[PDB]
Ligand binder design. Structure first.
Ligand SMILES: COC1=C(c2ccccc2F)C(=O)N(C(C)(C)C(=O)Nc2cccc(Cl)c2)C1
Ligand SMILES: COC1=C(c2ccccc2F)C(=O)N(C(C)(C)C(=O)Nc2cccc(Cl)c2)C1
Lengths: 260, 259
């Protein structure tokens, strides 16, 4: 893939692999999430940013500062099939002092149609303390030249109450869930959320919308419980929290549609 | 990718993705294993076989016969970095009535240097009974025209004894570990085997050789314990078995080099 003509977004193509699809012979939402993240890293790299802390600038690397996801919103109209070519376009936009925002459009490359959209909200925090920080003029000066200045939107949560309707308890990060900087991969949260969805609902529906609000990061030795209640098509409320009624990790919602 | 000019091997290039590497900033052995499997399905697809039961022929699908892995042997000289282009060549070879073999060669597509080698033995078994069958004439006829006929080798285990030195217990297949027809991905076993390797050894060594004997498949609702004992660079003996001192899933060995 590469930067577009104007140098303000990034495009990449992927052939959906055999291991990347589940029952429906289409890409899982974990595959989609991974490709969104891959095209992100490729955009960051192409303009000279580091993946450690997700597009670290100079004054950032200097201050041990990183971006982490406050929120991920993914909506899939159609999941690409095994052997299909999907095209993903991504860009980043400033959100003043709140933080930054990365957006994605997924297309069937063969046919040009929009098959998916994503948006994410990122905030600056300290790498060592894990403490959040607003965007100063000096850090915005370093990235603003890589972002469209005019708005460009891909898209122009309650705490779950005890008792949960459904649970998957004692979820542990495995070594393959850890990235190059030994951090639990964001795509893991999506899988842990869906693990508490009853097998029958996965078997007869497709995920159309997921929203995740990230509260704190799971470490490598942590153990997580995934809690789902029906709120409704089929709609669900989600909570990830540390084993032993520990702290909230994530909350989220999903919307599923019946298979054809 | 595509078949080679003689039509008897298959070649595919992969660009190593960010999420495919761990700490060393090189592709994990799991990523390697996944790319081996993918060039495998692409090969089976290229010559008209079904990916379900890992390259089934017409007679096989008729008789409810699939290929299962008996053994997987992988050696890595060098793990490709984030951004590197690896090229994998793969071919299959008849082992008469016992089954078939698939071999791979990995290459830095820039230097054309051999960065790794894999070999696998696959046996024929009835989907339903899980009973092993020797390969008939009618099934061999259907695939032998797609295999080199002269030998082509990419490479020219005891039961672990209680107590285990290291263990990781209660390992469960997650939804993402299951393939398109609800089978636990063979590559899952590699990850589980390595989960009982202590972190300090993974931080200070890279894996050079792994060998796995597959005894039976883990189902979606199964729970597995990963047991490892040092036998030695560092060598290990491994055992996956179902929780509750259940049946053996896998045995294997790993050899690790210092960084
Ligand atoms: C440097 O400033 C940032 C950019 C950026 C701006 C212009 C050009 C290139 C950029 F990376 C960016 O995308 N940032 C956020 C945190 C929103 C991000 O999504 N990072 C990110 C990195 C890797 C992977 C993924 Cl999935 C996300 C910060
Ligand atoms: C059809 O007969 C078989 C071939 C075959 C022979 C010639 C041309 C193409 C082929 F697929 C083959 O490779 N077979 C075994 C079981 C050894 C295999 O590796 N399958 C396999 C499929 C997908 C992925 C993976 Cl990781 C492995 C059986």
């Amino acid at each position: 893939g590469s930067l577009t003509e104007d140098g303000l977004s990034y495009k990449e193509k992927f052939v959906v692999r055999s291991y990347e699809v589940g029952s429906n012979k289409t890409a899982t939402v974990e595959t989609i999430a991974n490709l969104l993240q891959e095209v992100g890293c490729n955009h960051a790299q192409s303009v000279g940013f580091s993946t450690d802390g997700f597009a670290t600038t100079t004054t950032m690397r200097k201050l041990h500062l990183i971006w982490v996801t406050a929120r991920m919103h993914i909506e899939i109209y159609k999941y690409p099939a095994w052997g299909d070519v999907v095209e993903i376009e991504t860009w980043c936009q400033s959100e003043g002092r709140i933080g930054t925002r990365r957006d994605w459009i997924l297309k069937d490359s063969v046919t040009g149609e929009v098959t998916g959209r994503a948006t994410s909200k990122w905030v600056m925090m300290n790498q060592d303390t894990r403490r959040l920080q607003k965007v100063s003029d000096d850090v915005r000066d370093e990235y603003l030249v890589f972002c469209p200045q005019e708005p460009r939107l891909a898209f122009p949560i309650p705490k779950l109450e005890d008792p949960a309707q459904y649970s998957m308890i004692g979820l542990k990060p495995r070594r393959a869930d850890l990235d190059m900087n030994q951090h639990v991969n964001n795509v893991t949260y999506i899988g842990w959320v869906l693990e508490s969805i009853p097998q029958e609902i996965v078997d007869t529906h497709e995920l159309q919308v997921i929203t995740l609000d990230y509260r704190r990061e799971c470490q490598q030795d942590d153990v997580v419980d995934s809690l789902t209640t029906t709120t409704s098509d089929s709609q669900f409320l989600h909570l990830l929290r540390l084993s032993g009624d520990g702290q909230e990790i994530n909350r989220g919602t999903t919307l599923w549609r019946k298979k054809p």
